Amino acid sequence: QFAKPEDAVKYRQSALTLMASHFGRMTPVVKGQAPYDAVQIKANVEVLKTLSALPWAAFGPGTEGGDARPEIWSDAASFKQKQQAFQDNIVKLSAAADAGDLDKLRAAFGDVGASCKACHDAYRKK
């Protein structure tokens, strides 16, 4: 759906921005600094699920640009494992949210955050 690599870059940066917001807005809840409303969190994590599937198709071949490292494309299988593992970390968060289980939500939230970092440390430029 991208006319130029710049369009893929703009899309993925937008998608990732929306993920940072839907993930990060739960930090006060997991820390107990804001109240835990199970219905609210379930709905927010469903948005995050949808968004978390979107960036990867905007790293197609030849879409070097932005802050993406070239290693994304020299080993396609490894990058794919990264994004699939991340999306499965999101599945754990979804399951926690759907169960209304604050303790599982905390644990899954931490693991999701680690997975964001695991990808950045291999694949995102400084």
| Contact positions vs ligand HEC (CB under 6 A) | 9, 12-13, 16-17, 19-20, 23, 65-68, 82-83, 86, 112, 115-116, 119-120, 123-124
Please state the residue numbers annotated as binding site for heme c: 12-13, 67, 116, 119-120
State the minimum distance, in angstroms, from the CB of residue 70 to its own copies: 24
What stretch of H or E contains 10? helix 5-24
User: Using CA atoms, how far apart are residues 107 and 90, in angstroms rounded to an integer?
Assistant: 12
Residue 34's binding partner out of ligand HEC, its own copies, none, with CB under 5 to 8 Å set by partner kind: none
Q: Residue ranges of the alpha helices (H) in the chain?
A: 5-24, 27-31, 38-52, 71-74, 76-99, 102-123
Amino acid at 125: K
Residues in the chain: 126
CA atoms within 13 A on the CB side of 38: 10
**Contact between 1 and its own copies (CB under 8 A)?**
yes
Q: Which residue has the tokens 């802050």?
A: 67
State the minimum distance, in angstroms, from the CB of residue 7 to its own copies: 8
Residue 115's binding partner out of ligand HEC, its own copies, none, with CB under 5 to 8 Å set by partner kind: ligand HEC
**Using CB under 8 A as the criterion, which residues of the chain lie in contact with its own copies when the complex forms?**
1, 7, 10-11, 13-15, 17-18, 21, 24-25, 47, 50, 54
